[PDB]
């Protein structure tokens, strides 16, 4: 089997991407944030505290003839930005782009933090990291990809995120029309539960490439590119008037600037992030200070190749017995 679904930016900044997902019988379609940096499929639901729902579409298990309470199971997750959610668990039929999993754990939110409530466009998350990170207790649950893997034509999914435009998530096949050149594959460590790999270095604009190992994760659920402070300082030093602002919480730059590109290495290959991809616009409406798309990872404990980096490539998440990542230009 295979599946193919379009993923769409939630706003004009590409702050996140939403993909329609069918849950239950008859289908209830919710728009979920596919997140290769976590491993829980959770949704706004009829059980979510009413004051914490503001415009989201909810899953109602009592209206699904295939829903079954997973008795005794609870879940609770906190993400790296301080957001969180928790609740109980059903199993139900879940389909993505024509690919169907029966008995998928659907984690029903009883509580969500303010950042989720305030984002009316995101109806939940669909985790695509390794199932060892799943938070369901006392019986850990498998991701949608882990459950589908054996049925897929090939044990892979691909992320093809757009810049200010829709893109695609495919399951079970590699669309050879969706990229240019060849795909360069690189080793993955699953020891922390992430799609963790080592970039071979970077360049700023037309500058020379610096060969240096940068360990980080491929994370579709994080907006920005978070890298070591040395690398990020070298980038922003090329933008007149750019500075790190403690009050804003990162690097800002004059909105009148033209940003340089940023290149990262994948083995001997190179992925170029155009400068425009690094502009996240005014810090507040009408401000002439703009927020940068490359930020320091120093406070996080891991480097994160988020959407800013991944949307410059066609990315293969290879879930063979020894997992690997593939990157191609497009
Ligand atoms: O580790 C991180 C460090 C900084 C920012 C983020 C954001 N990532 C999220 C937020 C909510 C849901 C999924 N991913 C993660």
Q: Are residues 268 and 328 in the same domain?
A: yes
Which among 111, 23, 28 has a CA at the least distance from the CA of 75? 111
Q: Let me know whether 170 and 181 are in one domain.
A: no
**The tokens of 139 are what?**
């019986």
Kindly give the distance from the C-alpha atom of residue 251 to the centroid of ligand 1, in angstroms, as a whole number: 18
182 and 169 inside one domain: no
Cα 298 to middle of ligand 1, angstroms: 14
Burial grade of 211 (CB within 10 A; 0-12, 13-18, 19 or more):
exposed
Q: How far is CA 154 from the centre of its chain?
A: 22
Chosen domain end from 174, 199, 216: 174
Q: First CA to last CA across the chain, in angstroms?
A: 25
With a 6 A CB cut-off, is 237 part of the ligand 1 pocket? no
d(CA 233, CA 243): 9
Q: What is the 3-state secondary structure (H, E, C) of 112-145?
A: ECHHHHCCCCCCEEEECCCHHHCCCECCCCCCHH
**Ligand 1 touching residue 107 (CB < 6 A):** no
| CA 223 – ligand 1 centroid, Å | 8
Question: Side by side, which strands form the sheet with 262-266?
Answer: 269-273, 262-266, 196-204, 210-218, 303-305, 225-227, 294-296
Tokens of 14: 């590409």
Rounded-to-integer distance, Cα 84 and Cα 96, Å: 24
Query: Resolution of the experimental model in angstroms, please?
Result: 1.3
Whether 136 and 15 map to the same domain: the answer is yes
Dist. CA 330–CA 313, nearest whole Å: 6
Q: What residues have CB less than 8 Å from 40, skipping those under 6 apart?
A: 75, 77, 107, 125, 127, 134, 135, 136
CA of 300 to the centre of ligand 1 (A): 10
- Which of 36, 81, 115 has most ligand 1 atoms within 8 Å of its beta carbon, as the pocket-test mutant? 81
Please give the Cα distance from 294 to 214 (Å, whole number).
Answer: 15
Asked if residue 297 has its Cβ within 6 Å of ligand 1, the reply is: no
Q: Is the CB of 298 under 6 A from ligand 1?
A: no
DSSP 174-220: --TTS-SS-PEEEE-B-TTSS-EEEEEEEEETTSPPEEEEEEEEE-T
The secondary structure element, H or E, covering residue 41 is strand 41-43
Q: How far is CA 74 from CA 1, 30, 55, 112, 245, in A?
A: 31, 21, 25, 14, 40
Q: Quote the CA–CA distance of 22 and 95 in Å, as a whole number.
A: 5
Q: Are strands 99-112 and 41-43 parallel, antiparallel or unpaired?
A: parallel
**Which tokens is 177 given?**
């029309």
Residues labelled as active-site residues: 35, 199
Pairing of strands 225-227, 269-273: unpaired
**Token couple for 253:** 């730059």
SS3 of residue 65 by DSSP: coil
CA 165 vs. chain centroid, Å, equals 16
Give me ligand 1 centre to Cα 66, in Å. 32
CATH of the domain at 104: 2.40.70.10
- Residue given tokens 């609770």 in the structure block: 76
Say if residue 49 is in the same domain as residue 81.
yes
Shortest-distance atom of ligand 1 to CA 221: 14
DSSP state of 230: H
Q: Which residues contact 127 (CB under 8 A, 6 or more apart)?
A: 35, 37, 38, 39, 40, 41, 133, 134, 143, 144
Q: Under 8 Å CB-to-CB from 128, ≥6 apart: which residues?
A: 34, 35, 36, 39, 143, 144, 145, 157, 220, 317
Residue range(s) defining the domain that contains residue 80: 5-174
Would you say the CB of residue 35 lies under 6 angstroms from ligand 1?
yes
Query: How many other CB atoms are found less than 10 A from the CB of residue 163?
Result: 15
Same domain (yes/no): 190, 276: yes
Cβ(220) – ligand 1 distance below 6 Å: no
Based on the domain organization, do 70 and 156 belong to the same domain? yes
Cα separation, 269 vs 201, whole angstroms: 10
Please choose, from the candidates 242, 250, 257, 254, the residue with its C-alpha nearest in 3D space to the C-alpha of residue 225. 250
Residue of 226, 188, 201 lying closest to 303 (CA atoms): 226
Identify whether residues 61 and 187 lie together within a single domain: no
Q: Distance between CA atoms of 91 and 70, rounded to whole angstroms?
A: 6
Residues 78 and 143 in one domain: yes
């Amino acid at each position: 089997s295979t599946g193919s679904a379009t993923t769409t930016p939630i706003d004009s900044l590409d702050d996140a991407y939403i993909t329609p997902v069918q849950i239950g019988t008859p289908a209830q379609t919710l728009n979920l944030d596919f997140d290769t940096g976590s491993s829980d499929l959770w949704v706004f639901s009829s059980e979510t505290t009413a004051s914490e729902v503001d415009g989201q579409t909810i899953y109602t298990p009592s209206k699904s003839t295939t829903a079954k309470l997973l008795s005794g199971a609870t879940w609770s997750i906190s993400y790296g930005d301080g957001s969180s959610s928790s609740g109980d668990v059903y199993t139900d039929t879940v389909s993505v782009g024509g690919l169907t999993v029966t008995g998928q754990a659907v984690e029903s939110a009883k509580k969500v933090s303010s950042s989720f409530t305030e984002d009316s466009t995101i109806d939940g998350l669909l985790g695509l990291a390794f199932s060892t990170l799943n938070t369901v207790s006392p019986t850990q649950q498998k991701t949608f990809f882990d459950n589908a893997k054996a049925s897929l034509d090939s044990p892979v999914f691909t992320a093809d995120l757009g810049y200010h435009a829709p893109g695609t998530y495919n399951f079970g096949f590699i669309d050879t029309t969706a990229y240019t050149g060849s795909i360069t594959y690189t080793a993955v460590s699953t020891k922390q539960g992430f799609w963790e790999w080592t970039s071979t270095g970077y360049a700023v604009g037309s500058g020379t490439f610096k060969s240096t190992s940068i360990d980080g994760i491929a994370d579709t659920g994080t907006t920005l590119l978070y890298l070591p402070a040395t690398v990020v300082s070298a980038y922003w030093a090329q933008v007149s008037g750019a500075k790190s602002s403690s009050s804003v919480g990162g690097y800002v730059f004059p909105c009148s600037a033209t940003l340089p590109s940023f290149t990262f290495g994948v083995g001997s290959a190179r992925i170029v992030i155009p400068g425009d991809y690094i502009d996240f616009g005014p810090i507040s409406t009408g401000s002439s200070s703009c927020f940068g798309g490359i930020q320091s990872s120093a406070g996080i404990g891991i480097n994160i190749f988020g959407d800013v980096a991944l949307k410059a490539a066609f990315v293969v998440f290879n879930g063979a017995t020894t997992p690997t990542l593939g990157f191609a230009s497009k």
